[PDB]
Every structure is written in structure tokens, then in C-alpha cells.
């Protein structure tokens, strides 16, 4: 099940010749606490994405009960 | 309020009336061929009505130049239909079959919404 998308971003540049320096040999890589582990492209799966509006509705309807 | 202009195809309403009838001839002759050469539900009598129905749309037209243009465009479609450049879909486009009726009465439109 190897995919082109299993390559983590650490090595991604080195693998596409964007750089000649592997991640071990460079100290310019950041280590922020909010970085996330890699993931496949999940399509045709129960783990896939699905878009949704990110805004709560604007107009409030008058409540007769109170 | 009149102005001098260059004629399109005809010089008189009578000539324009003469041209329009010819377009009716050629279409009315052509319906039997269109039914055979197009895989469409409509029959000759139904189509021959559609020809009558639409020539009636432009019932109140008066300007000869406008009548010329309708006959220029009207003729262009016939050549595109005498030929089969127009595909099966395009011919049935004259009926708007997909669009379902929209009621006209006020109460129905109000309930259905704008």
C-alpha cells in the first residue's frame, strides 16, 4: 500500500531534490509544539475529509416560549 | 419619428411577409426528415405544432428590419437542422422538456416562495 504521500515533510524536500541536505544534516528545521505527524491521503475511506461551513448562523429567530 | 436606414434583405413589408412564408414552407417540408434522422420522442404532428406555436411568438413584430433578422436567424437554424450539425439534444431544446411548469396563480407562487 505504499503511496507517494507517505513521505513525511522532514524528508520531503530532500526527496524531491529541493535541497541537497538531509534533515539530520541541517539544523534549520523547526520543532514547534503544534506540528502534526504525517498522514496519508485518505480518500474513499471512513477517515476522509468532508467540508462544512465554519460560521455559526447569523440571524437569530425569536423564541415564543420565552 | 422616422429615419433613413439601409435595408437588411427586403424593402417592403410585403416582401418581408413573402420571405417569412418561405421559411415556413422549408420547415414544414423538413419535419418528416427531422423525425427520422433524430432519436427524439416527438412526432411530426407534435413538431408541426411547435413550428406553428413559435411563428406565433413573434405575432406583434412590425419593423421590417426586425422581421429580416428573425428570418436570417430562422433560416440559419434550418440549415443547421437540414444538416445534422445540431445534435439530438439541440432539437429537443425547442420544447424545454426538462423545465417543469411553474404555477402562475398568486396563491401557489406565494406558498412555493419566490
Amino acid at each position: 500500500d505504499y503511496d507517494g504521500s507517505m513521505i513525511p515533510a522532514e524528508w520531503y524536500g530532500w526527496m524531491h531534490y529541493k535541497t541537497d541536505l538531509p534533515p539530520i544534516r541541517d539544523g534549520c528545521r523547526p520543532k514547534y509544539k503544534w506540528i502534526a505527524d504525517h498522514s496519508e491521503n485518505l480518500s474513499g475511506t471512513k477517515e476522509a475529509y468532508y467540508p462544512y461551513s465554519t460560521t455559526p448562523n447569523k440571524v437569530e429567530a425569536w423564541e415564543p416560549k420565552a | 419619428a422616422v429615419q433613413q436606414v439601409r435595408p437588411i434583405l427586403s424593402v417592403d413589408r410585403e416582401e418581408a411577409r413573402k420571405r417569412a412564408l418561405n421559411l415556413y414552407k422549408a420547415w414544414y417540408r423538413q419535419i418528416p426528415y427531422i423525425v427520422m434522422d433524430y432519436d427524439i420522442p416527438m412526432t411530426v404532428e407534435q413538431c408541426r405544432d411547435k413550428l406553428r406555436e413559435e411563428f406565433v411568438k413573434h405575432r406583434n413584430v412590425t419593423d421590417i428590419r426586425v422581421i429580416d433578422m428573425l428570418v436570417i436567424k430562422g433560416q440559419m437554424e434550418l440549415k443547421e437542422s437540414v444538416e445534422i450539425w445540431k445534435q439530438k439534444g439541440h432539437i429537443m431544446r425547442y420544447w424545454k422538456e426538462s423545465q417543469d411548469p411553474k404555477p402562475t396563480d398568486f396563491l401557489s407562487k406565494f406558498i412555493q416562495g419566490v
Binding site: 477517515e47 476522509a48 468532508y50 462544512y52 465554519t54 455559526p56 | -
Partner: protein
């Protein structure tokens, strides 16, 4: 699942009766966990001495435009762009 009822940082969520949850029965609802409102709140303010200071996002040309802030008021002052807080004491 859990993700359906999770409320995003923008404050939106489909009601438990809303039909629009139907879209998630065969998929997931990624709600980001690194809420910016809390991470910036975590970073403590920077005490200064001068009356006005500048923040550029921290990395010059890779940061945001250089803006200057005036620290005369008591309350610690937020940068418009990065959200960092400054204070004079």
C-alpha cells in the same frame, strides 16, 4: 462519533437534530486542536523600559510589517498582527 459534537474554535457546530450531520456518517469532521486563541494567551508578555517598542513578527522579512506600540497606558498592549503582548514597568 466524538468529532460530530465537537465545537470548533470559530464557535460553530451542527445541532444534534440538524440533518446536515448526515454528511459525516461516512466521513470525519477534523476540528483543529491547536486553537490560536489559547496558544497566544499562553505566551507571557514582554516587559520593556522604553516608552515605545516595535514588533515585526520576530523574523524581519519573514514576519509581519513593522508596527510600533505606545506603552504609556498601564495595561499590557497587544500587537495587531501577531497578538504578542507588551508592557512597560
Amino acid at each position: 462519533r466524538g468529532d460530530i459534537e465537537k465545537v470548533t474554535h470559530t464557535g460553530q457546530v451542527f445541532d444534534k437534530e440538524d440533518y446536515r450531520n448526515a454528511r459525516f456518517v461516512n466521513a470525519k469532521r477534523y476540528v483543529n486542536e491547536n486553537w490560536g486563541i489559547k496558544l497566544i494567551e499562553e505566551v507571557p508578555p514582554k516587559e520593556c523600559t522604553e516608552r515605545v517598542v516595535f514588533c515585526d513578527g520576530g523574523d524581519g522579512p519573514l514576519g509581519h510589517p513593522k508596527v510600533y506600540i505606545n506603552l504609556d497606558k498601564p495595561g499590557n498592549h497587544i500587537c495587531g498582527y501577531c497578538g504578542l503582548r507588551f508592557v512597560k514597568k
